[PDB]
Design a protein around this ligand. Structure first.
Ligand SMILES: CCN(CC)CCC[C@@H](C)Nc1ccnc2cc(Cl)ccc12
Ligand SMILES: CCN(CC)CCC[C@@H](C)Nc1ccnc2cc(Cl)ccc12
Ligand SMILES: CCN(CC)CCC[C@@H](C)Nc1ccnc2cc(Cl)ccc12
Ligand SMILES: CCN(CC)CCC[C@@H](C)Nc1ccnc2cc(Cl)ccc12
Lengths: 390, 390, 390, 390
């Protein structure tokens, strides 16, 4: 049992483990676009001879509060063979990639978790919240205050340029935003066409400042699933939902969105936009505590304050926050706040309140005023959204 | 079609309309406890002769941010006969009760809505959020950080005094908290016993600083439903959930809680606490804008600011917020913020952000800095919860 | 945390823990009949003051192969409070009752398990198999060979004497048979009547040599559930099933029976008797290995053989089996067969083959001929059935 | 309406009737491999001109107790047109094939039945039992006694040689085992690949002494279906199940196995391996009573005995069984045992006990000692399994 960077000769064994581990994984052609994002030395394999474990990271760009874009190591393609469970393979692979990621100078790593109980112990905290809304569009009426009482129905492949430009504006202005490389647009637009005994055709609704990609469900022919709605203005968001609610042959429109989606408030009956599912989205491991805390912007409303933050096995820092900026310097002064690394990841994009984590003892301080100040400072003006799964 | 305060001779016709309108309504004995809370002139009936419409309010005490307790008119028992729809009965009954409530000096009215599209147009905004969590307790393990790694299993009727004292502490410290009168404790403890072909027996878990009332579901014998968990400390909340997760004969524990319930963070897998349902809880109509805005406490973190707020048909006010206090005085100066009355009710307990309502055009300003300041100021340190339905 | 025999003052706390632990437990009146079977010193309670754990045994008579009746300690009413999990309460209660049971001279203990993963580690093996058959009686035709091509439809309470006499003959001739005391007949016949919003009335089919007790399902009005069919002859079994298949208003007849129920072979289509559920029934802990192995009869077909059997922490014995009898004497000679105590319980009534347990390594020998001889000898001529849950 | 051996010109009409009769039947390419197993004169067709009935047999090799391999006529492709029901076509086709099978010298015929009420009257008895186990693998823990606390994840098409060799060892040592010809391995490995809008890819787990072929369900993405597990040793069976329980992305693993599968005993909770389905597997018609009874081996444990067996319209025989061998000679001496031919088929591989068939009057004797001796003698040391459907 050795742990190495894979050679081109390892990739067939990796694709077998992938096919057997990931139901969404069609075959090698799938991985081609994503592999362009994996740097030299971005991958590890465990050999027993055959591949019994693998893991890699991709080079991503993640938007954080203050419209700051961080280089981000996106962990993916993580699998242990069913023959080799409880042998410490995941721990050994995560330790090696984290060493490489930290040495390469990434301030943060990120992943999407297949289960919620695995990645906490390696320092990852859930940092965005997926919120599925299902609208019974047969009853949906727009409120007198709703704007637009400008959208075209189009084939996605015919308007690639406009989708790319709208998404680029959205990903730079929204925390959780990720740069989407041309190879991932190629993939996305390939999935837009109908598959024999698979998905139905995707259509687009296109506004100058937003787009919605949607397709009728395979089996439930009265359900339209919105795969992605990117709106740069409130006017575009409202205009796009007026068009979706105009899908008169549908009973129901579902979307995976974020907890602060204003959709319900656009309707005379807010209860029509039902939360049908909630789950952790992006997970974040802070690799360098001071680089990460200094990089993000903070709420201007909270006045200047100083404290001492200890991350369990991640350092102790003098943290001063004022005028929307943090300074985070080494100290041996007594800790006023303590938390595990994963908790910091959960606070970092504003998706979870320090007060909530404190009430579960995840965050530890003896100062309730300091807790209120942390809550306010780490809050994000622009609500955190989830870009695309990787 | 006349609209009057009911005489004792009207109540049999009101109980018939009630039985036909409310599936939860067993008979006159139900209403007895609640009727002790209805003041003289708290009720209206429409006669065609028989009762075709009714509505009333109860005298309540509602906790708002800053631990301030407001006298509150609780609208309830609202029904129009199925013979008399689209005759303006609800509008006429709500106009009359609102006149009486305002003249009596109540700063706020509140209700629980049977549908989400009715009460907005009469000035009520959804002000609390019901959040059902279902835990698959067979997988639930507590996180190493969770406290208490002190609770007794008891019969509710044998510990009335301790439940009453715990709830009284909780309702004074939590926004959304409602005073519970002795007659409603009588009702609650009567519903605790098993019913022939109805609910199963309720049990209690009792801690010095919290209690949980729960009962196995009628038909799903592997589901325990927590009807009410009131915890005054984080230690009590955690200790009570350790005991609920100890119900080894159950697969699932469900509770109707609030969006900031720390339960998920107590577990090694946060995904185990699944959101299975979300809905508006308490609705709030601000009756007197200046009395209500001056009564509640505000976030100390936001520095002093002044603006001019117009409520559509509710006045225009110079609003100055600093040191956690508001002053709200008449002005004819130009409005910087405009919103309908219902929107103010939705902001008032901190359950909805001004920014979210602004993005749906419900709240209207041309100043993004003022929006951030309103969001921060109206936010509640202690998360808003829902007391009990009325 | 003390462990004691309960006084009459402990029983209210035991009934609270019972109500909270067992959904089938109506109240103290339930336990009255069963409590007549609990000997002095048959019960233990753990006090923290309130009852946080309890367990007891009843005096039973269990039929084993060879029509031999053993005094049997029936463990029941076992519960640990949800407040007191992972404190070793079950282990401490089982250790104390086992000490008392062994000292009192019981050769075997027995229980029905609420979960399949608990009792193995205390030496209990599953010893009978519950097998639910559902017949689509609309297609059921009897085979030309089936007997009876003599039964009365009766009210159970009017023929108590005849049911008692038939059951007494059946329980003495069938391994798994249990003596049913008059107080359990009182209970059974009380459950025969309809309950408001509960079970429907039970009817009986009565033959001189068998009876079937059945009732239409609460909600599925086309399903008849046979709660108990006791047939002393093949003619009675066939005659009773002809009558059940005559329930022309039903679609389906279900029964919880044993794997060798001949019902399917009575039909022209054996597939009509569908196995819809299977589960462990009675569990058996052999308390005294030599007393138990010498008491039961063995297959006459297998010729005399001798071996040395070791039970893990239960002794090593020279075991000689011939002419349907075993002699089982102390030895320090080398073990030819080894197994944990629970495995012996699983073999004891003939429900599980030594060969099957050997293939999972539960039973360990290096002699395949000895395995075939054990399989044959422990096999039961009369198939093992399950009497009634306790 | 004539009954003939088909010419090559009949096969298009046979493929039409096949397509209309068998949902599993894709087209002529399906039948190609199976047709290599049909001897000259192995097929009959009824013509009205078009094909309204067909039936054929394949040359098979079936393993019976004692590791004896019998030439076996496998009936298959049996269909009557929906236009021609109740015209005696099936009876006429079965009479003709049985004449040919008996004259060709086959001692037994076998089939898989589409319904359970058809083939009894033509002398076929159900001889193996299909037993579906579904494991909730999220709770599955191996017992301390389980072996292996050696398997590779592989693509089936890349290890054909090893699967062929393992299966050949398994089919010779297991009653119910069938020789699998190269053309059926070609078919099997063709079905291993994914189909557009059909089955997902199959994977293999490969041990030196066993293999498991499995694939994720089409629609239930948390269910893995084991299509075939062939283990020549207990160590291989346990090692393969450790790997299947390592499919961490699955909730449930299902397999169609046999009633004596030791899997449940490998787990700390035997109840986790739930029986979700049971059905007759292989059916057997004894064509030559003396050839069949003399060919199979018998239990060595039962001492020498002699009896006289009558098969209804199948002869009367002096049957002497001792030292694991039978001698079966013509007699006119009085019958001590009588049964229809189908009953003998059901006894022949040890899947059904003589005592069980006797209790339904299918087997008739006045000697209970003779019944015990038949039960013991016909029992199979190695439990009967089902090879592959034909
Ligand atoms: C956990 C399930 N998986 C892994 C295949 C899908 C995750 C989401 C999708 C868009 N990501 C992917 C889909 C397909 N191939 C890929 C190859 C690499 Cl290297 C990385 C990510 C990939
Ligand atoms: C909309 C459905 N309803 C009205 C009966 C139940 C609402 C919640 C319950 C606890 N409230 C009530 C239940 C029963 N009776 C009552 C009598 C009056 Cl005056 C007021 C409230 C009541
Ligand atoms: C595990 C679920 N339980 C325990 C109450 C029911 C088991 C089957 C039933 C017939 N047994 C019982 C039912 C009711 N009360 C009883 C009191 C005693 Cl001491 C013992 C057994 C009892
Ligand atoms: C009753 C349903 N059927 C008959 C097609 C499928 C039975 C099982 C499968 C593996 N057997 C078969 C599948 C496909 N074609 C075949 C052609 C012949 Cl001659 C015999 C058997 C065949």
């Amino acid at each position: 049992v050795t742990l190495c960077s894979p050679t081109e000769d390892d990739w067939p064994g990796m694709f077998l483990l992938a096919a057997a581990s990931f139901t969404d994984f069609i075959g090698p052609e799938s991985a081609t676009a994503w592999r362009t994002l994996v740097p030299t030395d971005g991958a590890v394999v465990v050999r027993d001879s055959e591949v019994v474990g693998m893991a890699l990271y991709m080079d991503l760009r993640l938007t954080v509060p203050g419209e700051v874009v961080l280089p981000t190591a996106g962990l993916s393609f993580v699998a242990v063979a069913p023959t080799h469970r409880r042998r410490g393979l995941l721990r050994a692979m995560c330790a090696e990639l984290h060493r490489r990621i930290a040495d390469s100078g990434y301030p943060v790593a990120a992943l999407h978790a297949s289960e919620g109980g695995i990645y906490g112990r390696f320092g990852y905290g859930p940092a965005t919240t997926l919120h599925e809304l299902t609208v019974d569009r047969r009853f949906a009426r727009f409120h007198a205050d709703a704007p637009g009482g400008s959208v075209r129905l189009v084939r996605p492949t015919e308007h690639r340029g406009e989708f790319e430009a709208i998404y680029e504006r959205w990903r730079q202005q929204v925390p959780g935003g990720l740069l989407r490389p041309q190879v991932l647009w190629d993939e996305l637009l390939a999935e837009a066409k109908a598959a024999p005994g698979g998905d139905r055709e995707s259509f687009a609704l296109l506004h100058p400042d937003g787009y919605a990609l949607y397709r009728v469900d395979r089996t439930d022919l009265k359900l339209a699933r919105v795969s992605e709605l990117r709106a740069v203005t409130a006017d575009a968001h409202c205009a796009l939902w007026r068009a979706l609610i105009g899908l008169d042959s549908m009973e129901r429109i579902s979307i995976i969105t974020h907890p602060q989606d204003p959709l319900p408030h656009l309707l005379t009956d807010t209860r029509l936009a039902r939360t049908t599912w909630r789950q952790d989205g992006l997970w974040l491991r802070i690799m360098n505590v001071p680089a990460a805390l200094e990089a993000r912007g903070y709420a201007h409303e909270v006045g200047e304050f100083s404290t001492v933050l200890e991350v369990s096995d991640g350092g102790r820092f003098a943290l001063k926050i004022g005028d929307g900026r943090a300074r985070c310097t080494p100290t041996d002064a007594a800790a006023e706040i303590e938390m595990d690394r994963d908790v910091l990841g959960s606070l970092y994009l504003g998706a979870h309140r320090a007060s909530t984590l404190a009430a579960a003892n995840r965050l530890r301080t003896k100062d309730s005023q300091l807790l209120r100040r942390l809550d306010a400072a780490f809050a994000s003006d622009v609500p955190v959204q989830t870009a695309f799964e990787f």
